């Protein structure tokens, strides 16, 4: 639990800290306080429905490339958490999550 | 669309049965599996039990592999027998959705592709407490 | 000046060798195996095991 992130509305692009291997299959997430969330990207390429064309995701082609997600323009929601909920072939199962990627600002 | 609906009792006496229940409306058979999760004491997020479309069993070791949860599909419900309860997981359920995505980079006759999921739709949740 | 070589741990995704055979060339090329060595054989019935 390590306090993390960006403030303040000057934007930037975070990657969480597993390292790439075998084969990643990342599902970015927009946390939501008190409701339900919404997952960004799945399969790391297809977009869900609706979403705007910012939120990319790295391709998984010449295997030894890091995980990365680019933002901009932020709502409350890109003011919370963002998850890192990778599945690798050698790990098996990936029970944990990932980091989680608390924004803290103070004007 | 899909509707969510938390129904829980809230109060409930410890080492008793307890009964959890949500609602999906408009919705097809074996389209999509289901699952829950827990945000509560305020952490990251935690998983529990996913039961298939066939009322089978492969849940979170993380937890004791203690809770029996819904298959039911009566009407519209997914009832969640807790057994022996104790404080350390009392928690808010959210009824999620949950989906199986197949990833291949080699031969498939080989027996070499694994089984990620997704979660598109979550519930809001009910507070449950143990007294 | 005695350098062992040795099989460290396989980075990236795990992988089985295999090798790859034209499935329609393969079998024309053995029929045609069998039906000449039928000759040779009394126009018997060849099987491979
Ligand atoms: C000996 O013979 C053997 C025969 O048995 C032979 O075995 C073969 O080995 C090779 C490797 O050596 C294997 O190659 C792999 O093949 C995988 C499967 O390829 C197919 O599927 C993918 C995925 O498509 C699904 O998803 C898309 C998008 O959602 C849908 O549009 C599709 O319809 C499909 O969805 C169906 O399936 C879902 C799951 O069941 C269902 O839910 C769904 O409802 C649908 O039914 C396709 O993308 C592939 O298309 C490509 O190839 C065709 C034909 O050439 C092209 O026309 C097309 O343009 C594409 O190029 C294909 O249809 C591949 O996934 C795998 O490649 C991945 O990994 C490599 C790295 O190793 C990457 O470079 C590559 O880009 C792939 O990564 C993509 O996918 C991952 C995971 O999904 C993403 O995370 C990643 O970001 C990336 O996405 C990006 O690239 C995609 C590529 O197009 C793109 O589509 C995306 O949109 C995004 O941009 C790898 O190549 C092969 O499977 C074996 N075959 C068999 C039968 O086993 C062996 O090689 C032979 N030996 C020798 C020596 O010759
Ligand atoms: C075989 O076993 C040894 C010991 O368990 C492994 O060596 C460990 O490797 C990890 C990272 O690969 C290190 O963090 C440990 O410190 C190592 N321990 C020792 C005692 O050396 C070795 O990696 C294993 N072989 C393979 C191919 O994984
Ligand atoms: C083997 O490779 C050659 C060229 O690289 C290709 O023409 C042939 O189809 C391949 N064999 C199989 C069985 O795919
Ligand atoms: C095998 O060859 C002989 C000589 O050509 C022929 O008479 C015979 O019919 C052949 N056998 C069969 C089963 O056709």
């Given at each position: 639990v390590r306090p993390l992130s960006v403030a303040l509305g000057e934007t930037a692009r975070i990657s969480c800290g597993r390292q790439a291997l075998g084969s990643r299959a990342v599902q970015w997430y927009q946390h939501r306080p008190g409701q339900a969330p919404i997952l960004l990207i799945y399969n790391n390429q297809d977009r869900p429905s609706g979403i705007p064309e910012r939120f990319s995701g790295t391709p998984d082609?010449?295997?030894?490339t890091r995980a990365t997600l680019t933002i901009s323009g932020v709502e409350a929601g890109d003011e919370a958490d963002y998850y890192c909920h990778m599945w690798d072939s050698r790990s098996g199962f990936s029970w944990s999550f990932g980091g989680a990627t608390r924004l803290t600002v103070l004007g | 669309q899909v509707q969510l609906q938390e129904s829980g009792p809230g109060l409930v006496k410890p080492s008793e049965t307890l009964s959890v229940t949500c609602s999906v409306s408009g919705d097809s058979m074996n389209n999509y599996y289901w699952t829950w999760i827990r945000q509560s004491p305020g952490k990251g997020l935690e998983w529990i039990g996913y039961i298939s479309d066939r009322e089978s069993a492969t849940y979170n070791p993380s937890l004791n592999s203690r809770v029996v949860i819904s298959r039911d599909t009566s009407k519209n419900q997914l009832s969640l027998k807790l057994?022996?309860?104790?404080?350390?997981?009392?928690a808010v359920y959210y009824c999620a959705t949950a989906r199986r995505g197949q990833r291949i980079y080699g031969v498939v006759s080989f027996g070499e592709f694994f089984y990620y999921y997704s979660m598109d739709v979550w519930g809001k949740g009910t507070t449950v407490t143990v007294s | 000046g005695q350098v062992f070589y040795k099989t460290g741990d396989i980075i990236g995704d795990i992988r089985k060798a295999y090798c790859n055979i034209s499935g329609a060339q393969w079998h024309k090329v053995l029929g045609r195996v069998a039906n000449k060595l039928k000759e040779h054989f009394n126009n018997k019935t060849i099987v491979f095991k």
């Open positions: 082609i010449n295997f030894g | 057994n022996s309860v104790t404080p350390a997981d009392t | -």
